[PDB]
Every structure is written in C-alpha cells, then in structure tokens.
Design a protein around this nucleic acid. Structure first.
Ligand SMILES: [Ca+2]
Ligand SMILES: [Ca+2]
Ligand SMILES: [Ca+2]
Ligand SMILES: [Cl-]
Length: 54
DNA sequence: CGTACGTGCGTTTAAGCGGTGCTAGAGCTGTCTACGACCAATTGAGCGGCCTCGGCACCGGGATTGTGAAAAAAAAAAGCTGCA
C-alpha cells in the first residue's frame, strides 16, 4: 500500500478534470451522495459540448 | 369589389355516462452488501508570475463594387377622330 499517481481524467480517457468535476458536484448542494461515474459521465459531456463549439 | 367566413338550418355521429370484469404494474415490505462518505497521509497537476515574439490592429493607397442621375429609348397611356 504505497502505489500512487494516476488521475481519473486519464482513466476515463478524457481532457476535462473528472476529479474537479467530482468535487464541484460534491460541494454544490446537488445531492447528499455522488456516484463514482457521475463526474466521469458529466466531464465527458462538457468535453464534447466544448469540443463541438470549438 | 370579390368571396371568405358567420349564421342557421337539418342530419349524423360518437362522446359521455354508468356499469362490470380482468390484471398489469405501482408501490410496499424486509434483507444484505457493494459503494460512497469520511478520513488521514501523500504528491504531482494547475495556479500565479513572468518573459517573448508573432498575430492582428492600423495605415495608406489603389482595385473593384455599387448607386444615381441624366440623357435617351422604349413604354404604356392620353385627347381625337371616323364609321357603323
Ligand atoms: Ca448495491
Ligand atoms: Ca498562465
Ligand atoms: Ca506566440
Ligand atoms: Cl455512478
């Protein structure tokens, strides 16, 4: 148990910050609990809507 | 000034009622654990700060585009007949 480094954005194959998105969900008063996929799905959508506009 | 719509007739239709019978599926229970909160410790991604240098704002000057008058051609249109 000392095996560190990887980011969730990298796991999901994304550019947008999954971790940040997660925190933002958690800190936003949206729901008491937040699934582990919730931010991944969301971030990916924001990536796509961002990419489409650009 | 033309005919698209409102009125009002007689005829036609199926909405609404009040009821009966069948059951999908809404919604409830109780059980049990995978998952998410929280936690602390650990660490590298993203922040501010800084420096650079190439895109783009600004320029002048000439090429090209777009409008309007004026003169002119084409145009419908306007006072005058004849002939019936
Ligand atoms: Ca479960
Ligand atoms: Ca910066
Ligand atoms: Ca540059
Ligand atoms: Cl989830």
């Amino acid at each position: 148990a000392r095996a560190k480094a990887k980011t969730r954005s990298s796991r999901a194959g994304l550019q947008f910050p999954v971790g940040r998105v997660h925190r933002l969900l958690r800190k936003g008063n949206y729901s008491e609990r937040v699934g582990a996929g919730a931010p991944v799905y969301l971030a990916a959508v924001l990536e796509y809507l961002t990419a489409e506009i650009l």
